[PDB]
C-alpha cells in the first residue's frame, strides 16, 4: 500500500513516486515572508465553539499522535474567517523536528519554530469527509506554532496521555478534553490555500495560521519526540521528526487579517 515516511529512502523528496498530488500548484507548507502579506481588510475573525465531549481516543499511526473527534454531526465548529461557512473539528496532530531550534512546516520571515499543531476541520456541505478531499475547500486547518519557554499546563493534559500509545498501532480513549484552551491570547491569522503535508497531500486546504505561538517547555518537547514510530514488538525506532520541507509558492497569495 501507500508506503511513505520521513526517512532518507521513503522521505519528502521520493513520495511524488507513489503519490502524484506531491507535485501540484498548491502545495503545502510554505515560507512566509511579511513583505509580500498585505492585511485584507475584508477579512472577518473566526470562531470556535469546541465540545470537549466530542474527543473519542488518541493514537499513534507511527507518523504522528492525532486525538479523534466525532464528526458525525454538528458538535465542535469553527466558523468565520475566509471560510464559506461553519465546519466540523474532525483532529488534531503535531509536527515536530529533533531539536528545539526547528521543527514547525511554515516558517515566517525565515523563522522555524519547535513544532506546530494542526486542526482539521471539514465543510459538512460536501456530505462526507472522503468527498470533501476532492474540493479545493473542503477543510479548513487552524495552524499554531510552539516556541519554547515556561511549560504549558493546558497542553500537559494531553501529553499524560501520550504514555498509553507509545508504538505504531496504539490507540486510547480520550474524551472531556477542549483543544481552543491552547489558542493563544491573538487571533490574527495568515491565510492562503494549499494541501495536506502528508500523502497524499490533496490540495483541499483552506489554512489559517495563527501570528502567536503557544508556549511550551523543553520537557514537554523532549516528551513530545520519545514516542517511537516502530510496532511495540519491533526493533525501537524513535519518531525523531515529521515535518515537510517548505513547497513552491508558485502564483498563490498569502493574506492577513491584522495590520
Ligand atoms: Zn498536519
Known sequence: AKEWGYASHNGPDHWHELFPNAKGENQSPIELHTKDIRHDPSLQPWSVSYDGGSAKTILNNGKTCHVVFDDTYDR????????????????????????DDHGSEHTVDGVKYAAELHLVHWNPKYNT???????????????????????????????????????????????????????????????????????????????????????????????????????????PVPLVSNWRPPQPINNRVVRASFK
Open 76 to 99: 465542535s465548529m469553527l466558523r468565520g474567517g475566509p471560510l464559506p461557512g461553519p465546519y466540523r473539528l474532525r483532529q488534531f496532530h503535531l509536527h515536530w523536528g529533533s531539536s
Open 129 to 235: 469527509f472522503k468527498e470533501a478531499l476532492k474540493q479545493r475547500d473542503g477543510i479548513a486547518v487552524i495552524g499554531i506554532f510552539l516556541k519554547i519557554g515556561h511549560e504549558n499546563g493546558e497542553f500537559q493534559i494531553f501529553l499524560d496521555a501520550l504514555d498509553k500509545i507509545k508504538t505504531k498501532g496504539k490507540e486510547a480513549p480520550f474524551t472531556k478534553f477542549d483543544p481552543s484552551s491552547l489558542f493563544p491570547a491573538s487571533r490574527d491569522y495568515w491565510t492562503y490555500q494549499g494541501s495536506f503535508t502528508t500523502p497524499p497531500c490533496e490540495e483541499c486546504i483552506v489554512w489559517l495560521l495563527l501570528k502567536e505561538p503557544m508556549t511550551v517547555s523543553s520537557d514537554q518537547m523532549a516528551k513530545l519526540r520519545s514516542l517511537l514510530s516502530s510496532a511495540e514488538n519491533e526493533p
